[PDB]
Amino acid sequence: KTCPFYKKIPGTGFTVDAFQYGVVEGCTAYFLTHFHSDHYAGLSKHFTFPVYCSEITGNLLKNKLHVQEQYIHPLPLDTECIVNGVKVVLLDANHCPGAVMILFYLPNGTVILHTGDFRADPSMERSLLADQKVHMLYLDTTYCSPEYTFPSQQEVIRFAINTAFEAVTLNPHALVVCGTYSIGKEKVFLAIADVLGSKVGMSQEKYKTLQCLNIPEINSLITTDMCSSLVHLLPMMQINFKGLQSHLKKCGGKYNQILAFRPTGWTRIADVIPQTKGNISIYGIPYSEHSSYLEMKRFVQWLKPQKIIPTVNVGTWKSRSTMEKYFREWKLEAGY
Ligand SMILES: CO/N=C(\C(=O)N[C@@H]1C(=O)N2C(C(=O)O)=C(CSc3nc(=O)c(=O)[nH]n3C)CS[C@H]12)c1csc(N)n1
Ligand code: NI
């Protein structure tokens, strides 16, 4: 495949999250917004062009994908930087650790925001974004439809902490399991382990990944000694009745209950009822690191871009058409 147009920044030689197309012709610099596999797809130890990213993303490139250090160009956040003759700023995307949005200040006075993947927040409206007009927006449209309503991260964490704390205080032999398949959503397991006074147990591979994320005091919070911990991280693929029944056999049968948390259910918060089989309960918690529809709408209506380019769900005519209809509705409502 060749690089799609929505991964190219016009008036520049820049691409964003475009590593799976080989040598992109006329690309002078490759930006990586965050360390999720659809975005880094293609990077390896044999990559020989400059990669611009956050420090955390660079740590993950170095240690997990074995990208050579000479090609990793970490940039600080909230700082005007010049990359191949163009002023850029990286901003926190409120996504996963190391995830950024990129502001490009084009020679002709155009300003472009690329959100990477993000969860829009009103905090962004009082940030550096407020200090200049932004003309073009490359937008994370993951949940650009009104049925995507889910609660705040804080509300979801409140539910998870309360559920776990109650269960473990009632039954000291209970185990909490959190599923994972990528970086992001670390707050779920860290918050639960904090309330329980436990470290989070995990594989060496997961431990290594977390050690790349610049989380303060991380050494006090995580461990590879599983049976010393009340909170385990497992691959998301194991979060099912058979997988958790098998896990219950570990640590000499020390545990007699599992409460597992699986991020899901995007389409009150107390109405989260688990799927239960005997002493295993699986809670499908709607913890998202992407904008809800209303969050996305608010951000775009505040920013008032002249042109929106979706970067997600662009593969079907139906999805493209429906997104463009929402953008038009938003524009007409707000008057821009
Ligand atoms: C709230 O849970 N949301 C989940 C999820 O983790 N679902 C659970 C899961 O894997 N479940 C399974 C089962 O084990 O097959 C089932 C199937 S019912 C069942 N399967 C058995 O194998 C068994 O021995 N007894 N019973 C009764 C119900 S949903 C639950 C989810 C959302 S997306 C995704 N892939 N999973
Ligand atoms: Ni992502």
UniProtKB/Swiss-Prot annotation:
Induction: During mitosis. The mRNA encoding this protein contains an internal ribosome entry site (IRES) in its 5'-UTR. This 5'-UTR generally suppresses translation while specifically promoting expression during mitosis, when cap-dependent translation may be impaired. It is found in: Nucleus. It comes from the Eukaryota. Expressed in brain, heart, kidney, liver, pancreas, placenta and skeletal muscle. Binds constitutively to TP53BP1. Binds CDC27, which is itself a component of the anaphase promoting complex (APC). Binds PIAS1. Belongs to the DNA repair metallo-beta-lactamase (DRMBL) family. May be required for DNA interstrand cross-link repair. Also required for checkpoint mediated cell cycle arrest in early prophase in response to mitotic spindle poisons. Possesses beta-lactamase activity, catalyzing the hydrolysis of penicillin G and nitrocefin. Exhibits no activity towards other beta-lactam antibiotic classes including cephalosporins (cefotaxime) and carbapenems (imipenem). This is DNA cross-link repair 1A protein. The lineage of its organism: Eukaryota, Metazoa, Chordata, Craniata, Vertebrata. The gene is DCLRE1A.
